[PDB]
Swiss-Prot record:
Protein family membership: Belongs to the RxLR effector family.
Name of this protein: RxLR effector protein PSR2
Domain notes: The RxLR-dEER motif acts to carry the protein into the host cell cytoplasm through binding to cell surface phosphatidylinositol-3-phosphate.
LWY repeats: 54-144, 145-235, 236-326, 327-419, 420-510, 511-597
Disulfide bonds: none
Subunit structure and binding partners: Interacts with host dsRNA-binding protein DRB4.
Region ranges (7 X 93 AA tandem repeats): 6-597
Subcellular location as annotated: Secreted; Host cell
Top-level taxon of the source organism: Eukaryota
Annotated Gene Ontology cellular component terms: extracellular region; host cell
Organism: Phytophthora sojae (Soybean stem and root rot agent)
Gene deletion effect: Exhibits significantly decreased virulence when infecting soybean seedlings.
Length: 597
């Protein structure tokens, strides 16, 4: 508010513009002096007493560096320059303060720390002094062509390469900084390439050593991978792979667990997957075995959740890739790997069973089941071999409704459908695992239960056929069924009726001679024992008929071996009342004079 001429007289005096600055109350204006009416008049006055714009500016700045630190005045010119009407003002002052900075021979790095850009961390790309700093850099590169610098390099000098990457990753998510953030992630790569930094170098340079095993999660791990990619495209004759450079810091035994764990985690899934694909290829080329591959992938620790382990499908396809065209049993197949771990297939089979109940594991289940059937077929297992493999000889009474039963029966189908001449029946497995006495009782007991009756009855008959095919002398079967141990109550013994059925079948196919039942009885128990038994079983419905025909047969045998009415009498007195014994003797001697004669 001096008013027009008053300063004109202070301008014809050539008064120092310092005193005018003080007389216009610009001391307590602070940092919001960017403009406060007044300043345009005071500038006008400094231009008045000076003879060139440069010197006018130089004097203003001599007033200002007394009051403001280089930082704060640089920021005031920053916010100042933005506004219209402060633009060609603060360009003349920024001009001036920079040629002072070069007079003072202060490097752009010096200025970098005078501003506090080495402190601004992630928000550096937003500092109002960044653009001011790069102005002073541009000029300093014009005037010191020997010793230039670039934003990215200066930034690397203080924060370090890890820290610079961290800042650029951060400044990429917010969208005002994103453009420059990308441009400088590129200049970071360019600078590394120019120094001939390799991937080995950049690994540590990005400090992926630190954090150890957690390294795929680190966000400079993606920076390191892109850098390998760039180096590959700039050096086609020493091309390497991320996996290649990884196997220098980790051997397979710890690298593969790291990948397995990472593949689960969704945020690292793609990275893990990419690396796993190369690992498999390496293994395939070296013909590393599916047993080693099963352990490397930790499958040997899955216990009973094997089929829900996300590396199972991998390991299966690895195994089939290796063995395809290696065909000629120098193969190593999935069932052999299973057998190195379990001592029989039942544990896998059970897993299959459990897995086919749940709908999202029915694919892998069917896949494993097929390997089981493949392996069984190739080593030439007949179905009774599979029965043993399936451990069905250790279930006892329970076999027919152990869940593995279906497995066995399916194989028996899938086998015979592929094998016409020597086709086998369901009982072959059971015969293979059970005794004969044991197998019969089991079937007899399965006949009580309505749920197992039909099948039990089918198996009874097939067992008869299996004893025929084996050409089993009925007498010896009678031994095996423990029917010799007592004559008492033998026609009520259900085992015995089983043996009776087998007898009739063995006679129905006509051999050299009939196998006679009364012969087996007499052999095991002797004449009187058998006669007495028969007297008892006749006085007794439900055995009456069979006992009648066996009594007839006994007499016939006696007649044939020419046993005299005296000797027969003697026997019969041992086993009936005198009225019954005298009567049967009548019959016998009648049928003995008809023959001798």
């Amino acid at each position: 508010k001096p008013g027009l001429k008053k300063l004109l007289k202070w301008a014809d005096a050539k008064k120092p513009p310092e005193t005018v600055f003080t007389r216009l109350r610009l001391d307590k204006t602070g940092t919001q002096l960017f403009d406060n009416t007044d300043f345009p008049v005071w500038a006008a006055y400094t231009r008045s007493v000076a003879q060139t714009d440069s010197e006018a500016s130089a004097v203003m700045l001599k007033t200002l560096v007394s009051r403001y630190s280089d930082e704060v005045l640089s920021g005031m010119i920053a916010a100042a320059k933005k506004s219209s009407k402060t633009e060609s003002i603060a360009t003349k002052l920024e001009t001036e303060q920079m040629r002072t900075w070069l007079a003072a021979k202060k490097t752009p790095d010096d200025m970098f720390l005078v501003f506090k850009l080495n402190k601004a961390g992630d928000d550096i790309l937003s500092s109002p002094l960044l653009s001011a700093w790069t102005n002073y850099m541009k000029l300093s590169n014009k005037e010191n062509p020997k010793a230039q610098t670039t934003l990215i390099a200066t930034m690397t000098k203080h924060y370090g390469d890890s820290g610079v990457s961290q800042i650029l990753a951060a400044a990429r998510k917010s969208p005002a900084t994103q453009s420059t953030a990308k441009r400088l992630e590129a200049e970071q790569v360019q600078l590394w390439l120019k120094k001939g930094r390799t991937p080995d170098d950049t690994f540590t340079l990005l400090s992926l050593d630190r954090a150890g095993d957690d390294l795929l999660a680190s966000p400079q791990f993606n920076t390191w991978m892109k850098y390998i990619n760039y180096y590959n495209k700039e050096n086609p004759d020493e091309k390497t792979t991320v996996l290649a450079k990884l196997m220098t810091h980790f051997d397979d035994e710890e690298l593969t667990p790291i990948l397995v764990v990472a593949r689960k985690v969704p945020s690292t899934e793609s990275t893990a997957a990419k690396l796993q694909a190369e690992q498999f290829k390496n293994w395939l080329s070296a013909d590393k075995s599916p047993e080693e591959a099963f352990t490397l992938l930790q499958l040997d620790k899955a216990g009973d959740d094997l089929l829900t382990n996300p590396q199972l499908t991998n390991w299966l396809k690895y195994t089939e890739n290796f063995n395809l065209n290696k065909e000629i049993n120098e193969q190593v197949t999935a069932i052999q790997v299973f057998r190195a771990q379990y001592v029989d297939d039942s544990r896998i089979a059970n897993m299959v069973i459990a897995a086919e109940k749940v709908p999202n594991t029915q694919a892998i289940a069917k896949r494993v089941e097929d390997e089981l059937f493949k392996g069984w077929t190739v080593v030439l297992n007949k179905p009774d071999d599979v029965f043993i493999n399936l451990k069905l000889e250790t279930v006892g009474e329970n076999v027919f409704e152990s869940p593995l039963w279906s497995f066995y029966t399916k194989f028996l189908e899938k086998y015979n459908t592929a094998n016409p001449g020597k086709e086998q029946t369901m009982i072959s497995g059971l015969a293979r695992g059970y005794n004969d006495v044991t197998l019969t009782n089991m079937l007899l007991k399965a006949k009580e239960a309505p749920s197992t009756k039909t099948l039990a009855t089918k198996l009874e008959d097939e067992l008869v056929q299996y004893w025929l095919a084996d050409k089993k002398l009925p007498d010896k079967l009678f031994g095996y069924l423990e029917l010799k141990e007592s004559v008492d109550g033998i026609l009520t013994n259900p085992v015995f009726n089983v043996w009776l059925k087998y007898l009739n079948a063995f006679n129905d196919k006509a051999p050299v001679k009939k196998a006679l039942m009364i012969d087996t009885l007499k052999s095991a128990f002797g004449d009187v024992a058998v006669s007495n038994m028969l007297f008892a079983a006749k006085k007794d419905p439900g055995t009456a008929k069979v006992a009648a025909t066996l009594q007839t047969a006994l007499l016939s045998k006696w007649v044939l071996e020419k046993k005299t009415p005296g000797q027969v009498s003697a026997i019969l007195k041992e086993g009936a009342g005198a009225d019954v014994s005298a009567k049967l003797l009548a019959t016998y001697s009648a049928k003995f004079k008809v023959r001798w004669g």
